[PDB]
């Protein structure tokens, strides 16, 4: 009855925001949700609690002993729409696997059963940059079932969406993990919405929704709140709600069909993003050629 979703994607592209607003809109509908930050940056809840930076498990844990030294009381907080959120905790510089900090945060929640609790949804905000075994954690332990990738028109951003798909498959066979779809964050690029859907198909999935770039958003952030708790009547507001509906009834939980760096390139250059390689001028000075 409780669906476990996780949002993956490259960093610095409003992913955490979209996610949080998604949950926000998801809250209005009446769905009890829970977010679990797995982004080393630790900032996946700020927009719900208004706080500048929630206390990560790994922090309070090193201020008590091991782990079960503390209690969900000061680790799990209820913000707007009664949403419950906890941030895993950034790995210790130089020493420590980010993934590690995640499991321990999950298992902890498992132990004090922060799950069994009428939750309809639980979103694991996960950074999907260098898709390693660390960040793949929530999928390996099989705690995440529905995967929604966040990206936009950009090589690296898409290059991530791809490698993440690769990852999903690596387990999708011996597991139930699936790729619900893609979410494109408007980066005000021409034919951006087109480029993603195209790519989605190559993977065998679909672009669940296209989040435009309204500025009412940057207003809420500054306010530390979500587009919803800020202006429940803005345009961008009903935009996310559209994503909420879509997710609630998605059916495309599939196993992506990864593509080659070349297949990928082919698209970019084709949508006007990437250039076209001039195999000849390669290694030619402004003098000889």
């Amino acid at each position: 009855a409780m669906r476990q979703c996780a949002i993956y994607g490259k960093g610095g592209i409003g992913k955490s925001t979209t996610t949080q607003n998604l949950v926000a809109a998801l809250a209005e509908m009446g769905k009890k949700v829970m977010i679990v930050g797995c982004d080393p940056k630790a900032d996946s809840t700020r927009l719900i609690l208004h706080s500048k930076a929630q206390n990560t498990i790994m922090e309070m844990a090193a201020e008590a002993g091991t782990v079960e030294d503390l209690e969900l009381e000061d680790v799990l907080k209820a913000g707007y729409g009664g949403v419950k959120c906890v941030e895993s905790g950034g790995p210790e510089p130089g020493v420590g696997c980010a993934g590690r900090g995640v499991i321990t945060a999950i298992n902890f929640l498992e132990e004090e059963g922060a799950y069994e609790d009428d939750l309809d949804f639980v979103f694991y905000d996960v950074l999907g940059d260098v898709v390693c075994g660390g960040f793949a954690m929530p999928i390996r332990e099989n705690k995440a079932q529905e995967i929604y990738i966040v990206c936009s028109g950009e090589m690296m951003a898409m290059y991530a969406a791809n490698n993440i798909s690769k990852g999903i498959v690596k387990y999708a066979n011996s597991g139930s993990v699936r790729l619900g779809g893609l979410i494109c964050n408007s980066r005000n690029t021409d034919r951006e919405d087109e480029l993603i859907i195209a790519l989605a198909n190559k993977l065998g999935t679909q672009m669940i929704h296209f989040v435009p770039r309204d500025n009412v958003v940057q207003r809420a952030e500054i306010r530390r709140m979500t587009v919803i708790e800020y202006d429940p009547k803005a345009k961008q507001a009903d935009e996310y709600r559209a994503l909420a509906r879509k997710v609630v009834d998605n059916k495309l939980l599939v196993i992506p069909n990864p593509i080659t760096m070349d297949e990928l390139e082919e698209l970019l250059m084709e949508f006007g993003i990437m250039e076209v390689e001039d195999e000849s001028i390669v290694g030619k000075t402004a003098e000889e050629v």
């Binding site: 079960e68 209690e71 132990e111 004090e112 059963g113």
Partner: protein, 522 residues
């Protein structure tokens, strides 16, 4: 060799030179064993703090557990009912160990059967093993009731105990009014205590679910008492005794105190006393229902409060001075019977004892383990005595419990260095006793080894084991002991202080060395 006059058994037979030189060849010759010096290396390693860290990181491996499966408790529970025959619907090999296990702990005959399901049933369940089974059993050991439980197999292939039972009645394998309560008991869920919970619940239903109409809380002026998974006869008794001494009308639900101590008079009884069925049927009419070992009777409290509509109190297992008070009181409150001078005195005496020998118990570090209620009650009591329960382990416990305990620990100066662990096993505890060494271990026989180990490292490192719990095999008749109530408190208090003094003697028995502190009067 043997001197017909003074025969030597396994030990010290093999200490004879020939046997010595015998095994020596076998070793060097074909064992290809690691040079001693290595074994000594590796060993020493395990007694370190480093090994601990590595040890506590275990996830998939479990070494020397401290819990058993559900059925084991379903069986025991079922034994508490008049002419009831524990029936475990599943592979027969299981029942084997069950009886076999209890026998070693009670040194009494454990009667229990199995509908011997096999491979040929891993596809079409055992809707037949049930049919024939129930019939065979009923006609052979002619019980008044048959309680059904399940084994690992049974649940994995998933069989509907209810259905199967309903058909065995329909198809005419056993009368239709023949009591056959049931409960699913998956090995892979909770410990043995959970079995009991289930089982009991399963019986409660069978006699009160389809007939709550003519029932009216308080109509009988009695209090129901559910002992839970108890293995110390003396307990069942002390409860009955205290209540009867209080003039309280009670109905002990699930009383195996008789079949577990049938006398040796020339004839074998497979059944003896126990909770009558009528007692169960009527239970609902009881003023209230008290749970002796709540921490593992939630599925019962639910049903009891939910159906019978009783206001089950928030009581702790009655162990130690404090809690037992609370128990007696709450009992009074309910029954309306004053606490008799008799008990007021027993108590006073328990206190006398405490004062009489605190000096020795004070500041004594213990490492212990067992079941939830038991463990926490033991912890509570040690605190009332001024000891420091440093390693409270409990393999089958949960988080909610761990908290309640920490709460108990935090409320006492003597709980500063206390740590509670759940999910951990005896191999973990093994380390906790090497690194952060206590003075004794309070637990079951499985702990006899941990001791051996502590000694292998050295006399000054050995940690004497104090048998209190379950199961116990290297000692006799301890199952007649008592841990509940004031009677219990006293026993434990003695088993303790004396265990301590027992050892202090051993440490100062050295002639002209340490025998100076070998005082006569202590």
């Amino acid at each position: 060799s043997q001197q017909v006059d003074k025969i030597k058994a396994s030990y010290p037979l093999f200490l004879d030179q020939d046997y010595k030189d015998m095994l020596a060849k076998k070793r060097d010759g074909f064992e290809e064993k690691y040079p001693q010096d290595k074994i000594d290396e590796v060993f020493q390693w395990t007694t370190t703090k480093e090994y601990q860290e590595l040890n506590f990181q275990r996830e998939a491996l479990t070494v020397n557990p401290a819990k058993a499966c559900q059925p084991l408790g379903a069986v025991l529970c079922a034994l508490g009912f008049e002419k009831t025959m524990p029936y475990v619907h599943g592979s027969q090999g299981c029942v084997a160990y069950f009886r076999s296990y209890f026998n070693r702990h009670f040194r009494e005959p454990v009667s229990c059967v199995s509908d011997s399901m096999t491979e040929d049933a891993a596809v079409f369940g055992g809707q037949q093993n049930m049919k024939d089974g129930l019939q065979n059993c009923k006609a052979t050991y002619k019980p008044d009731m048959i309680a059904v439980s399940t084994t690992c197999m049974a649940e994995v292939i998933g069989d509907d105990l209810n259905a199967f039972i309903n058909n065995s009645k329909k198809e005419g394998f056993i009368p239709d009014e023949f009591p056959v309560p049931f409960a699913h008991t998956p090995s892979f869920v909770g410990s043995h205590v959970t079995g009991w919970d289930n089982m009991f619940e399963g019986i409660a239903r069978y006699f009160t679910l389809k007939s709550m109409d003519d029932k009216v809380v308080g109509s009988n002026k009695k209090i129901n008492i559910v002992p839970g998974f108890e293995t110390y006869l003396g307990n069942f008794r002390v409860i009955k005794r205290m209540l009867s001494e209080m003039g309280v009308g009670y109905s002990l639900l699930s009383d195996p105190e008789e079949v577990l101590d049938t006398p040796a008079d020339g004839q074998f009884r497979m059944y003896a006393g126990g909770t009558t069925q009528e007692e169960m049927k009527d239970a609902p009419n009881a003023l209230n229902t008290v749970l002796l070992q709540p921490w593992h009777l939630e599925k019962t409290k639910k049903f009891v409060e939910g159906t019978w509509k009783h206001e089950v109190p928030k009581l702790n297992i009655p162990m130690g001075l404090d809690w037992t008070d609370e128990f007696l009181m709450k009992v009074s409150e309910i029954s309306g019977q004053p606490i008799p001078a008799s008990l007021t005195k027993e108590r006073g005496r328990l206190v006398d004892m405490m004062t009489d020998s605190h000096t020795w118990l004070h500041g004594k570090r213990f490492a212990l383990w067992g079941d939830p209620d038991f463990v926490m009650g033991l912890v509570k009591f040690l605190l009332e005595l001024g000891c420091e329960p440093v390693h409270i382990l409990c393999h089958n416990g949960n988080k909610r419990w761990k908290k309640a305990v920490d709460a108990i620990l935090a409320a006492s100066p003597y709980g500063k260095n206390a740590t509670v662990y759940i999910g951990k096993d005896l191999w973990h505890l093994r380390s906790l006793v090497f690194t952060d060494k206590p003075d004794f271990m309070i637990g079951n026989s499985y702990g006899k080894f941990i001791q051996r180990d502590t000694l292998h490292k050295g006399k000054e490192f050995e940690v004497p084991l104090i048998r209190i719990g379950f199961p116990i095999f290297d000692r006799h008749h301890l199952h007649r002991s008592t841990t509940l109530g004031y009677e219990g408190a006293m026993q434990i208090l003695t088993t303790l202080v004396n265990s301590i003094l027992e050892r202090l003697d051993e440490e100062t028995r050295g002639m002209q060395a340490t025998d100076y502190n070998h005082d006569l009067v202590r």
